[PDB]
Amino acid sequence: GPVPLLESNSNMRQMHNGMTRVVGSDYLGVVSVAGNPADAAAKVRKVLSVSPSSFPGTRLTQMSDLWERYVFRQFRVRYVPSVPNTLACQVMVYQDTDPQDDPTAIKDADALLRQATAQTGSQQWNFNSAKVIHLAKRSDNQLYYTGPVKENPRFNQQGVVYFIQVSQALDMNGKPLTADMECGSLYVDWVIDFQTPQVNP
Amino acid sequence: NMRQMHNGMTRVVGSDYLGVVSVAGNPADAAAKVRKVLSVSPSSFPGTRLTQMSDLWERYVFRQFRVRYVPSVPNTLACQVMVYQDTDPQDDPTAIKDADALLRQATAQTGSQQWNFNSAKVIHLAKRSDNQLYYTGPVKENPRFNQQGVVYFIQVSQALDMNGKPLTADMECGSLYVDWVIDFQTPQVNP
Amino acid sequence: TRLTQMSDLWERYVFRQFRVRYVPSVPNTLACQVMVYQDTDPQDDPTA
Amino acid sequence: VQNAPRIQQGGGPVPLLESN
Amino acid sequence: IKDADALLRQATAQTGSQQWNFNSAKVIHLAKRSDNQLYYTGPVKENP
Numbered sequence: 001g002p003v004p005l006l007e008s009n010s011n012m013r014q015m016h017n018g019m020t021r022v023v024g025s026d027y028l029g030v031v032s033v034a035g036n037p038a039d040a041a042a043k044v045r046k047v048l049s050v051s052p053s054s055f056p057g058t059r060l061t062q063m064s065d066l067w068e069r070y071v072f073r074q075f076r077v078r079y080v081p082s083v084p085n086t087l088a089c090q091v092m093v094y095q096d097t098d099p100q101d102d103p104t105a106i107k108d109a110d111a112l113l114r115q116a117t118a119q120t121g122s123q124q125w126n127f128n129s130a131k132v133i134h135l136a137k138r139s140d141n142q143l144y145y146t147g148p149v150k151e152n153p154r155f156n157q158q159g160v161v162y163f164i165q166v167s168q169a170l171d172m173n174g175k176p177l178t179a180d181m182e183c184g185s186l187y188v189d190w191v192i193d194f195q196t197p198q199v200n201p
Numbered sequence: 202n203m204r205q206m207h208n209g210m211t212r213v214v215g216s217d218y219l220g221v222v223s224v225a226g227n228p229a230d231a232a233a234k235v236r237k238v239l240s241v242s243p244s245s246f247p248g249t250r251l252t253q254m255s256d257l258w259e260r261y262v263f264r265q266f267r268v269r270y271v272p273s274v275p276n277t278l279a280c281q282v283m284v285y286q287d288t289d290p291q292d293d294p295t296a297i298k299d300a301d302a303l304l305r306q307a308t309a310q311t312g313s314q315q316w317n318f319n320s321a322k323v324i325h326l327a328k329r330s331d332n333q334l335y336y337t338g339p340v341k342e343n344p345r346f347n348q349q350g351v352v353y354f355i356q357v358s359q360a361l362d363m364n365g366k367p368l369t370a371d372m373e374c375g376s377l378y379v380d381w382v383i384d385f386q387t388p389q390v391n392p
Numbered sequence: 393t394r395l396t397q398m399s400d401l402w403e404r405y406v407f408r409q410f411r412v413r414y415v416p417s418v419p420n421t422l423a424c425q426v427m428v429y430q431d432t433d434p435q436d437d438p439t440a
Numbered sequence: 441v442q443n444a445p446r447i448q449q450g451g452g453p454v455p456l457l458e459s460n
Numbered sequence: 461i462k463d464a465d466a467l468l469r470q471a472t473a474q475t476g477s478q479q480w481n482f483n484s485a486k487v488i489h490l491a492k493r494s495d496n497q498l499y500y501t502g503p504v505k506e507n508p
Binding site for chain 1: 202204205207211212213214215216250253254256257269271320321322323378380388390
């Protein structure tokens with residue numbers, strides 16, 4: 001047809017609008033638990049941003065820099081224990097859709113634990129066993145920017161994950177644990193939509 | 202922990218900058234007339250979006266891979282040049298002792314093209330009926346498990362100025378670009 | 393295994409299935425946390 | 441009457457040993 | 461055999477084989493032979 005001929009010597013690279021699903025899973029990190037929490041702010045144990053770009057050296061961050069905007073279709077945190085059943089401690093995790101809250105400002109532990117128990121999708125369990133945790137949906141379906149924070153976090157992150165210690169790390173014989181324990185590790189099972197391709201600084 | 206398996210192919214579109222091209226005014230070494238050579242493979246370039254994409258899957262196939270030449274020279278200058286995309290990585294053109302056999306071989310390939318470097322051009326790959334998949338990443342043994350082929354930029358004519366005369370020194374003459382489309386399979390990270 | 397003896401009687405093969413199944417030897421009074429996977433690229437070598 | 445989302449308990453027993 | 465893996469694999473082969481944790485009881489059977497030969501009693505003499 002005419003088109004291959006017109007193509008033959010005109011510099012027109014095509015535009016490429018459109019979505020792109022990608023699926024994967026990644027290893028986020030190790031998690032510790034102190035024997036004698038008392039700072040109240042110390043009860044929080046592992047905050048995380050819920051953005052593709054925030055976990056260096058993973059497949060997510062590598063892929064994330066190559067586009068412009070993103071939306072998770074599911075973001076499912078998973079926890080794998082590395083502790084003997086004889087030991088005792090209790091733990092909860094919750095995801096929060098609003099990046100600007102920061103629980104830690106509260107001076108009393110009870111209010112932290114109660115705020116955590118509130119909000120849908122929250123989870124608490126013994127730190128001896130595996131569990132799985134979900135995001136809540138947002139009806140509007142906004143796109144979010146990729147990359148490191150610039151001025152306002154709300155343009156970027158869909159949310160924040162909080163890993164919160166409850167009770168105290170505890171030993172056989174029931175003495176409170178000295179120092180720290182490696183406990184377990186966090187994982188992610190994700191699906192994402194990307195929009196317009198690029199590279200960014 | 203229902204860690205799930207996936208076996209689908211993932212379509213992806215993009216384009217990237219392959220670099221500068223230059224031309225000597227009076228080639229005579231015959232093997233000097235071949236001018237530039239590039240691997241046709243993901244993960245064979247520094248800093249492109251494509252090489253970064255490359256490491257995150259096991260296998261790939263290009264669906265199109267059109268090289269595009271953009272001139273950077275005034276109309277007063279002129280020379281003829283050729284480009285082609287061999288689909289066999291191990292054929293190696295340089296072994297030929299004669300300029301003529303080189304030009305003939307280079308011309309015989311499908312999709313190879315010839316033009317003045319005054320102006321823009323576009324060039325395609327051949328397709329294959331195997332639907333064979335290629336491994337991503339650097340050669341370990343045999344190019345043939347990796348590369349779909351090799352790209353050659355080859356000079357033909359001398360390099361006349363205005364008033365039809367050769368120029369004393371080689372010079373830059375535009376640059377290469379690549380539009381592309383790819384399928385990937387199983388996700389991973391190469392060691 | 394019987395299969396490795398069987399295998400020399402033909403030129404070519406394809407697995408349609410290959411389920412590994414780990415079997416514990418240890419009481420719940422111990423822990424290590426372990427992972428397993430099946431790379432499909434025989435040239436790839438983690439050790440490097 | 442107006443319901444609010446509920447907590448919903450789960451989990452189960454852990455054996456000293458899994459025979460195989 | 462000089463290698464442990466081959467021993468364990470030969471053991472796993474053949475019908476009626478059994479593997480388990482050494483903490484618990486198990487029961488194990490013979491395979492039948494269709495011919496039904498008689499066998500001699502007493503200590504070995506020449507051929508087992």
